[PDB]
């Protein structure tokens, strides 16, 4: 049943690609090297467009897409784990859109390969990326699987606080080592986010499966906490819409099943 539903979801994604969900910007010769993976490009229709430092001739491109939230606002930015040479673009994104919380679902190294560059911290070790200065104010464990880093970010004489939550043990294609710790991540993200329309920044290595699982869980939790559930509410519909905004948002049958069980638990 769930396996049939997820298969239907993949059929629709395949159809969208054949029909022409476009990927022109991501395919520009000036942009190709900014993609972590050749097979994961952001859809033009929902891609994140960077205008910070425009006047200086900086490119508008980053491999990342907006995903709409329960209220129809632009509630998430789903993006890849930054590369050595797109760290500056990552911070441009965080700064332009007033991001207060970053959720990271991957590690720097997975399966022996580099999966995401460190863009934060560390203790007594500030990070300078272009005109950005990142300083580690404090860090601590939210729980055994999640680090919470409090960052001071400085750009053009202005300073902001940005929080980063990193989940340590969630493999690509699969599910988190602790489902309760994942929910605690989302809960703490929301506490830090507070009120305010700024999007949450969510990323994994590719910005697909683990990223989409997180966004979906927050989406449904927000629905549960803030709105009346539509009498025809459907997880199929939600995930389908997610995939329409970010490629392979929810990448795998396993993750789709995980989502269903998690959502049913949240509803109770």
């Amino acid at each position: 049943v769930l396996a049939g539903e997820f298969s239907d979801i993949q059929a629709c994604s395949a159809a969208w690609k054949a029909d022409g969900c476009s990927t022109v910007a991501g395919s520009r010769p000036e942009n190709v090297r900014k993609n972590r993976y050749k097979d994961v490009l952001p859809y033009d229709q929902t891609r994140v467009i960077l205008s910070l430092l425009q006047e200086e001739g900086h490119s508008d491109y980053i491999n990342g897409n907006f995903i709409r939230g329960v209220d129809g606002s632009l509630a998430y930015i789903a993006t890849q784990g930054p590369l050595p040479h797109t760290l500056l673009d990552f911070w441009r994104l965080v700064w332009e859109f007033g991001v207060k919380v970053i959720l990271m679902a991957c590690r720097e190294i997975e399966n022996g390969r580099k999966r995401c560059e460190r863009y934060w911290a560390q203790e007594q070790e500030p990070l300078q990326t272009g005109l950005f200065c990142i300083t580690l104010i404090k860090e601590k464990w939210l729980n055994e699987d999640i680090m919470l880093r409090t960052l001071k970010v400085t750009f053009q004489k202005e300073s902001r606080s940005v929080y980063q939550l990193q989940y340590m043990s969630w493999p690509d294609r699969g599910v988190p080592s602790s489902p309760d710790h994942m929910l605690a991540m989302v809960e703490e993200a929301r506490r830090l986010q507070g009120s305010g329309p700024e999007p949450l920044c969510v990323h994994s290595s590719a910005g697909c499966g683990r990223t989409g699982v997180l966004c979906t869980v927050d989406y449904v939790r927000q629905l549960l906490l803030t709105q009346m559930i539509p009498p025809d509410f459907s997880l199929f519909d939600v995930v389908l819409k997610m995939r329409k905004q970010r490629p392979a948002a929810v990448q795998t049958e396993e993750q789709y099943r995980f989502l269903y069980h998690t959502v049913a638990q949240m509803f109770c």
Partner: peptide
């Protein structure tokens, strides 16, 4: 260099 090989 691919992430969605099996997906």
């Amino acid at each position: 260099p691919e992430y969605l090989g099996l997906d």
